[PDB]
Amino acid sequence: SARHSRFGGLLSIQTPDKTRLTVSGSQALVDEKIALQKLDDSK
Amino acid sequence: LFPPNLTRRYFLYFKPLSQNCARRYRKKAISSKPLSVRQIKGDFLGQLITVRGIITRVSDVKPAVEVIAYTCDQCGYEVFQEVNSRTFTPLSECTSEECSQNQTKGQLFMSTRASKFSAFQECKIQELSQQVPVGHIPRSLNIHVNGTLVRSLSPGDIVDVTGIFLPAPYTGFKALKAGLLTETYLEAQFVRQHKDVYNRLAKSIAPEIYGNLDVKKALLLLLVGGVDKRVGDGMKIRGDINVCLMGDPGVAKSQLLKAICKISPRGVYTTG
Amino acid sequence: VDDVTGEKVREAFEQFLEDFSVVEKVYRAQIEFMKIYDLNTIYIDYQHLSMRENGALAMAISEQYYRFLPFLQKGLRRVVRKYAPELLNTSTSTSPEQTERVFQISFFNLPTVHRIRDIRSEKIGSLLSISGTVTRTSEVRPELYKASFTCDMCRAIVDNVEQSFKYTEPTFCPNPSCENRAFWTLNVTRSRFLDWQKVRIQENANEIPTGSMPRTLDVILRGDSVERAKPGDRCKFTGVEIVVPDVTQLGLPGVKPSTTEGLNSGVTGLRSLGVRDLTYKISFLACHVISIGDQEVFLNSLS
Amino acid sequence: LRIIWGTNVSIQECTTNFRNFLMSFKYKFRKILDEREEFINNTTDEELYYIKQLNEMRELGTSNLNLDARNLLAYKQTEDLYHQLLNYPQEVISIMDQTIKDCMVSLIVDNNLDYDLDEIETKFYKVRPYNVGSCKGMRELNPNDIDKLINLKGLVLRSTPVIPDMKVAFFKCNVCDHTMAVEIDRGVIQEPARCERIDCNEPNSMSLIHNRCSFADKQVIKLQETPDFVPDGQTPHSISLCVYDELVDSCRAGDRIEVTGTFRSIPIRANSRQRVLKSLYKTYVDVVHVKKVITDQDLAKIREVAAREDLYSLLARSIAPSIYELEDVKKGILLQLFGGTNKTFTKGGRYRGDINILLCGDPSTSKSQILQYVHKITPRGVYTSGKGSSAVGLTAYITRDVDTKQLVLESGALVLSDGGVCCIDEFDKMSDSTRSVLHEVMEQQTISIAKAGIITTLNARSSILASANPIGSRYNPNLPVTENIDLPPPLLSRFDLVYLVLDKVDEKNDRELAKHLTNLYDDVLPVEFLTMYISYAKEHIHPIITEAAKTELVRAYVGMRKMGKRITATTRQLESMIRLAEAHAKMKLKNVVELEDVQEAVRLIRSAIKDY
DNA sequence: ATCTGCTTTGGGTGGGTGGGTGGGTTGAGGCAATT
DNA sequence: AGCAGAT
């Protein structure tokens, strides 16, 4: 992320069914593969 | 689902019982009866009372948290926690039904965008000079202001603050050490603030002395201080008329200073 | 897993210290000179490094000095072994205490010199020079370098325990039968200590913007570079910009942990940091110092 | 599908909207929006603006793009983007940054230029919005503004040293020496429980190598509101800021700045042991933009003014226009500003090129005026009054930093005037120690301090232009200058020129002065041109003496000695004359000292010896 | 997963072999330098 | 009471 760690951008990804998951990170704000990678890694 | 306070967009305050209305209906109004900081004793705790004094200190407005909104990085749910104390312990593990059923350990994180904050401000109220007994020193009392009452008190104003007299319990170890002694404060709920031309003006400047027409004229000229200061060439001629009074002790110098300083809007009285 | 980049950087360093010339060999002679007079620091001209290897080797060291420094010490030791085998051991009767020298590499003559106000966090771990006027100097203390412990129960020994910014002890005894994991006693006889001095410097007066308070920094000297800076001097240090953790939080034996209005929040989540955070500071590690500002004995000095 | 948390606005639509805005936009839209369409030209307004801004940025290698909010309101597409920026600044700024990077790479990809692409891929790109609405007040910041873009105008008050903020953590194994870098999220390290290597899967064998991590620049500034925002006059409040990356050290203490940032709030822990937090939240501002509120042509103009026949009187008049009928004093001060040549000598000591002038006379006349003017003109200098607590202090002094509780050596006014003019308004009332340090400066041109364990010397190559007043209510011509001035003969003997400006009561003189003063209710030069000319001459020109000048100097000195047994002149006057001639040569931008320069110098020195 | 155990706030119911660059800040009294 | 460690 270009900005600092505490910038604080929050995400809401929509699953094929109508449920929303939350991800943090500008890269997630831009991309979806990064979002899924973070979802897997945060487990 | 979410606490009732989260969706509230209003603040509730109590206006005390006015003296005239209490007398109209043959009743006694404790709430609107003014008290000094001395009379506010330990048996008034938990009541709606009024205090008379002058404000000596007002802190800056800041956000006080009422409801905290968390988020789950796995379940995708949101949690709400209510805070009604000086301190609190944040949540660190998801409590959502999905997380518990699936056992997934999803960390909870704070979110300031969804929380609820109330404007907070702390003031101090001190006894008036005429209220302190003989051979005593004045006392002061804390005041808490929340909601839309903030910025309604400034240092120097003589006010009749109406509020709820409550204790401020300590927390954790400090509570154990402090014993049974308790700090107290007042939750502000209502605040009442208290309140030939040349010759005529000169003679009216200070009527309690014997007339000094020339000095009074010069002092009035000082007070108005008319000047056109726009040289704009690097600096400008001074835009104030300065006056000096020098006399043997016995003439009304201090009285003239006091009067000329009270009349002026920006007058500041000091001693060398 | 070996560091492939680390090994190759060492190989290039050895080639530099054997074939360089300007027409006699320069650093080969210095190692011989160091052998005669029994010194420790070996000085290297940065300009000498750039010309060799199209300048590639110089960039690797300068950009990442903290990472590659241990490999340089390996490289020097090999070149020391080929030409001056006796130098490695530290200098009527047979002395028993001949440990291994603790060499130091000093660099000078960098292309540019940085002001105190121009120190940023992008250069952490790199090699650079700075200029400032000293204002306070600490006292020389012994710094633990290679600690040596003994197991409290089976009397085993642990040697060469690299020390981080805080006191460090072993976590696993080398005796298979032993079960000790967190019980040790230091052995100051076998431990190696290095000299250590803390110097505080501030930016030069002429470089201060008008009506601005000065900036300051803390420089750490070691070995023979100690006491080379006196307060009031205008020096030029050359070292590596480092970051020093708040050792109180990390957990010290017998120590209880614990400008910016509370906004200086550190990083957390580390295993050692239970619920506390680790905050950092910018510091310096100088390896070179320059201060900008009887008949028979006298005759011998003259040319 | 990607949606910002708590809202119903798509990120993809935002990205495409801003990309369309950037690739196609013209200033004419902004002009018509502000009702300035009639000022539209045909070349600049009709050319793509931000495409040119990206091309120039690529050419210069910079990354930061200064964006104005109104331009978003100028384009039909981006009204919602502007409002979202004002309401959700973080995510909007993120998508803006990525769109900037994407369009930057796309430009090269489409235009198949020879510029390297790997270098572009390595750069972090940013946008710095500003002018996002009427600036609010520090006292009007309510909780409703938390996480929202605001504008603050305030005076800087302090700035802490650069703080290393961690970006990427670095971990190393203790049994396989395997390292992997793990990013950071909101200040928490996601440290691993075991090596990622299949072969070595040992658990809980990770260490943090602090010096191999990645850090970013952070700094904390303190801000205080402007005077005009104070309603009654109470103590101004203070707000704390945070600046990251290229905005670090973007403003110095005492500056008036306008800051655009996100009004954030963070919890505070009750103690450094547990996780309990105080209910009160502390606020601050996360800044994204800060604003503060010689050429060949200049050289040609300087030559044109230099060639002017009446250059001398022109500069003299321009120095201090508002003063009346003090030509000699102004001429002397003009010479002082330029300063004589400075000599670096081998086999010999250093010879100072400064000029010290004492402006002493009755209190009625204008003397602090001239010092203020000189301070304004001087490229370097200070203003001070002897025995004045307000002034910084004339001598370097050791003190303790209250902010950091450290000892710091602080240079005084004289040292800070190095290469400039230090105007001391009240020369008469001075401490004896101050008069000793002044003697050391005017003699050795350095200040030596050897206290608090520090032994140091500071260069103080500064001129002096002091003013003096008589002991009584007026200057008595009968008594000598020394008796009236109340200064040691050793001290007033060192000034190169001493000016006795007396207010003798004359009908004509008072008439003229009153006429001038009342009217205040021959071209002249702007102060900026004068200071640039002075700096150019003082940095580039170095006049040299010649045989004719050497003859005239010797002859004039001998003549000034022969006038007297009373000693009319001393060898000090010779140094004064040579310095003044050098300064006069400098003013003409001449590299040589002619007969005219030495003759002008003698006329001023002889007149100065005259009434003094 | 449960049981066992230490330490705060800040303050003298921890201290001066931990000090004052870890904070608790006015009041009085002695000494050198300044007068 | 919260958090740090041994069975």
Ligand SMILES: Nc1ncnc2c1ncn2[C@@H]1O[C@H](COP(=O)(O)OP(=O)(O)OP(=O)(O)O)[C@@H](O)[C@H]1O
């Ligand atoms: N003309 C006057 N008429 C009435 N009272 C006067 C007059 N002049 C002086 N006084 C009285 O004189 C008393 C002393 O005056 P004040 O304190 O103002 O000045 P002062 O004694 O000259 O001052 P200082 O305190 O500097 O010695 C006041 O009570 C004032 O009422």
Ligand SMILES: Nc1ncnc2c1ncn2[C@@H]1O[C@H](COP(=O)(O)OP(=O)(O)OP(=O)(O)O)[C@@H](O)[C@H]1O
């Ligand atoms: N050309 C001039 N000649 C004489 N007096 C002047 C002139 N221009 C301005 N003045 C007067 O001088 C004043 C500014 O000078 P200033 O008061 O500083 O006098 P000074 O001699 O430097 O010092 P002091 O403060 O002791 O009077 C202006 O307010 C005006 O009264």
Ligand SMILES: [Mg+2]
């Ligand atoms: Mg009086």
Ligand SMILES: [Mg+2]
């Ligand atoms: Mg004056």
Ligand SMILES: [Zn+2]
């Ligand atoms: Zn969950």
Ligand SMILES: [Zn+2]
């Ligand atoms: Zn063992």
Ligand SMILES: [Zn+2]
């Ligand atoms: Zn491993």
